[PDB]
Amino acid sequence: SINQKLALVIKSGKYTLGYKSTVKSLRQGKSKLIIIAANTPVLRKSELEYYAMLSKTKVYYFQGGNNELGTAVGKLFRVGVVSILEAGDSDILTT
RNA sequence: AGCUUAUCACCCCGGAAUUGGUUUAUCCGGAGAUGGGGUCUUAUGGCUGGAAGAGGCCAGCACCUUUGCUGGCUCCGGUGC
Protein backbone atom coordinates (compact mmCIF):
# COMPACT_ATOMS: atom_id res chain seq x y z
CA SER A 1 0.00 0.00 0.00
CA ILE A 2 1.78 3.10 -1.29
CA ASN A 3 -0.71 5.43 0.44
CA GLN A 4 0.14 4.04 3.88
CA LYS A 5 3.88 4.09 3.16
CA LEU A 6 3.69 7.64 1.79
CA ALA A 7 1.61 8.79 4.76
CA LEU A 8 4.21 7.51 7.23
CA VAL A 9 7.12 9.39 5.62
CA ILE A 10 5.23 12.68 6.02
CA LYS A 11 5.07 12.37 9.82
CA SER A 12 8.68 11.28 10.33
CA GLY A 13 10.76 11.88 7.20
CA LYS A 14 11.68 14.92 5.13
CA TYR A 15 9.81 15.56 1.87
CA THR A 16 9.44 18.30 -0.73
CA LEU A 17 6.44 19.26 -2.87
CA GLY A 18 6.33 21.03 -6.21
CA TYR A 19 8.19 20.93 -9.51
CA LYS A 20 10.57 23.85 -8.93
CA SER A 21 11.78 22.62 -5.53
CA THR A 22 12.07 19.01 -6.75
CA VAL A 23 14.46 19.97 -9.56
CA LYS A 24 16.56 21.90 -7.03
CA SER A 25 16.80 18.82 -4.79
CA LEU A 26 17.80 16.56 -7.70
CA ARG A 27 20.34 19.14 -8.88
CA GLN A 28 21.91 19.20 -5.40
CA GLY A 29 21.80 15.41 -4.96
CA LYS A 30 19.63 15.61 -1.83
CA SER A 31 16.76 13.60 -3.36
CA LYS A 32 16.29 9.86 -2.93
CA LEU A 33 12.89 9.20 -4.57
CA ILE A 34 10.51 11.17 -6.79
CA ILE A 35 6.80 10.40 -7.23
CA ILE A 36 5.07 11.72 -10.36
CA ALA A 37 1.33 12.10 -10.89
CA ALA A 38 -0.35 10.29 -13.77
CA ASN A 39 -1.69 13.42 -15.50
CA THR A 40 1.67 15.22 -15.49
CA PRO A 41 2.53 16.54 -18.98
CA VAL A 42 4.87 14.21 -20.83
CA LEU A 43 7.46 16.91 -21.56
CA ARG A 44 7.73 17.78 -17.86
CA LYS A 45 7.71 14.07 -17.01
CA SER A 46 10.47 13.46 -19.57
CA GLU A 47 12.60 16.26 -18.10
CA LEU A 48 12.22 14.92 -14.55
CA GLU A 49 13.26 11.42 -15.67
CA TYR A 50 16.35 12.87 -17.37
CA TYR A 51 17.32 14.72 -14.18
CA ALA A 52 16.92 11.55 -12.10
CA MET A 53 19.08 9.63 -14.57
CA LEU A 54 21.96 12.09 -14.11
CA SER A 55 21.69 11.96 -10.30
CA LYS A 56 20.92 8.20 -10.12
CA THR A 57 17.56 8.75 -8.41
CA LYS A 58 14.82 6.12 -8.38
CA VAL A 59 11.54 7.15 -10.04
CA TYR A 60 8.07 6.00 -9.00
CA TYR A 61 4.94 6.70 -11.06
CA PHE A 62 1.87 7.40 -8.95
CA GLN A 63 -1.31 5.69 -10.16
CA GLY A 64 -3.42 8.82 -9.94
CA GLY A 65 -3.73 12.49 -10.86
CA ASN A 66 -2.43 15.57 -9.12
CA ASN A 67 -5.68 15.72 -7.13
CA GLU A 68 -5.08 12.21 -5.77
CA LEU A 69 -1.37 12.72 -5.05
CA GLY A 70 -2.14 15.84 -3.01
CA THR A 71 -4.53 13.85 -0.83
CA ALA A 72 -1.95 11.09 -0.27
CA VAL A 73 0.55 13.61 1.15
CA GLY A 74 -2.18 15.05 3.35
CA LYS A 75 -2.58 18.38 1.56
CA LEU A 76 -5.65 20.31 0.43
CA PHE A 77 -4.07 21.35 -2.89
CA ARG A 78 -2.95 19.61 -6.05
CA VAL A 79 0.59 18.22 -6.09
CA GLY A 80 2.26 17.30 -9.37
CA VAL A 81 5.46 15.70 -8.08
CA VAL A 82 6.80 14.74 -4.64
CA SER A 83 10.50 14.55 -3.79
CA ILE A 84 11.56 12.42 -0.82
CA LEU A 85 14.66 13.81 0.89
CA GLU A 86 15.08 11.14 3.58
CA ALA A 87 12.80 8.48 5.02
CA GLY A 88 12.05 8.20 8.71
CA ASP A 89 10.48 5.04 10.12
CA SER A 90 9.00 4.08 6.74
CA ASP A 91 10.51 1.57 4.31
CA ILE A 92 9.37 3.16 1.05
CA LEU A 93 12.94 3.15 -0.29
CA THR A 94 13.29 -0.61 0.29
CA THR A 95 9.98 -1.57 -1.35
C1' A B 1 9.59 66.21 -32.27
C1' G B 2 12.67 64.94 -27.52
C1' C B 3 12.44 63.15 -22.51
C1' U B 4 9.07 60.94 -19.37
C1' U B 5 4.43 58.40 -18.06
C1' A B 6 0.49 51.98 -17.64
C1' U B 7 -3.81 48.64 -16.19
C1' C B 8 -2.63 43.87 -18.30
C1' A B 9 1.35 40.62 -19.07
C1' C B 10 6.29 38.72 -17.87
C1' C B 11 11.23 37.79 -15.08
C1' C B 12 14.40 36.91 -10.43
C1' C B 13 14.51 35.70 -5.16
C1' G B 14 11.53 32.90 -1.94
C1' G B 15 8.26 28.34 -0.56
C1' A B 16 2.51 28.96 1.56
C1' A B 17 -3.35 25.29 6.32
C1' U B 18 -3.66 29.04 11.93
C1' U B 19 -5.21 28.65 3.56
C1' G B 20 -3.98 33.48 1.96
C1' G B 21 -4.67 37.25 -1.79
C1' U B 22 -8.62 39.72 -4.12
C1' U B 23 -13.29 42.46 -7.77
C1' U B 24 -19.23 46.53 -7.78
C1' A B 25 -19.57 41.67 -10.05
C1' U B 26 -15.69 35.09 -7.24
C1' C B 27 -11.85 34.10 -9.23
C1' C B 28 -6.43 32.81 -8.55
C1' G B 29 -2.06 29.83 -6.18
C1' G B 30 3.36 23.54 -5.15
C1' A B 31 1.67 23.59 -13.23
C1' G B 32 4.59 28.21 -7.32
C1' A B 33 0.15 32.45 -3.93
C1' U B 34 1.01 36.57 -0.63
C1' G B 35 5.57 39.50 -0.24
C1' G B 36 10.41 42.16 -1.83
C1' G B 37 13.09 43.69 -6.23
C1' G B 38 12.80 44.19 -11.70
C1' U B 39 11.30 44.08 -17.42
C1' C B 40 7.83 45.63 -21.23
C1' U B 41 3.31 47.62 -24.80
C1' U B 42 2.85 54.20 -24.94
C1' A B 43 -4.10 54.08 -25.62
C1' U B 44 -3.14 58.39 -22.43
C1' G B 45 -1.17 62.33 -19.55
C1' G B 46 3.08 65.78 -17.89
C1' C B 47 7.35 69.10 -19.14
C1' U B 48 10.09 71.28 -23.22
C1' G B 49 10.79 72.47 -28.58
C1' G B 50 6.96 74.21 -32.41
C1' A B 51 5.53 79.37 -29.56
C1' A B 52 4.13 84.21 -28.87
C1' G B 53 7.06 86.47 -33.17
C1' A B 54 0.58 83.91 -33.49
C1' G B 55 -4.27 84.68 -31.76
C1' G B 56 -7.27 87.27 -27.73
C1' C B 57 -8.46 91.50 -24.39
C1' C B 58 -7.38 96.75 -23.32
C1' A B 59 -4.92 101.77 -23.02
C1' G B 60 -2.49 106.11 -25.18
C1' C B 61 -1.55 108.68 -30.21
C1' A B 62 -1.72 110.43 -35.38
C1' C B 63 -6.13 111.18 -39.72
C1' C B 64 -9.80 112.86 -46.58
C1' U B 65 -5.82 109.62 -47.09
C1' U B 66 -2.08 104.21 -49.63
C1' U B 67 -4.32 104.18 -43.28
C1' G B 68 -1.01 102.60 -39.49
C1' C B 69 2.36 103.87 -35.03
C1' U B 70 3.71 103.00 -29.48
C1' G B 71 2.48 100.63 -25.18
C1' G B 72 0.62 96.93 -21.28
C1' C B 73 -1.87 92.08 -19.62
C1' U B 74 -2.79 87.27 -21.66
C1' C B 75 -1.82 84.20 -14.54
C1' C B 76 -2.70 80.43 -10.57
C1' G B 77 -6.52 76.67 -8.54
C1' G B 78 -10.94 73.44 -7.14
C1' U B 79 -14.98 69.87 -7.89
C1' G B 80 -18.08 64.98 -10.05
C1' C B 81 -23.22 58.26 -9.83
UniProtKB/Swiss-Prot annotation:
Example GO BP: cytoplasmic translation
Positions bearing the Glycyl lysine isopeptide (Lys-Gly) (interchain with G-Cter in ubiquitin) cross-link: 14, 45, 75
Subcellular localization: Cytoplasm
InterPro entries referenced in this protein's UniProt entry, alphabetically: Ribosomal_eL30-like, Ribosomal_eL30-like_sf, Ribosomal_eL30_CS, Ribosomal_eL8/eL30/eS12/Gad45
Function: Component of the ribosome, a large ribonucleoprotein complex responsible for the synthesis of proteins in the cell. The small ribosomal subunit (SSU) binds messenger RNAs (mRNAs) and translates the encoded message by selecting cognate aminoacyl-transfer RNA (tRNA) molecules. The large subunit (LSU) contains the ribosomal catalytic site termed the peptidyl transferase center (PTC), which catalyzes the formation of peptide bonds, thereby polymerizing the amino acids delivered by tRNAs into a polypeptide chain.
Other noteworthy facts: Present with 59300 molecules/cell in log phase SD medium.
Similarity remark: Belongs to the eukaryotic ribosomal protein eL30 family.
The name this protein goes by in its record: Large ribosomal subunit protein eL30
Species for this entry: Saccharomyces cerevisiae (strain ATCC 204508 / S288c)
Phylogenetic placement of the source organism: Eukaryota, Fungi, Dikarya, Ascomycota, Saccharomycotina
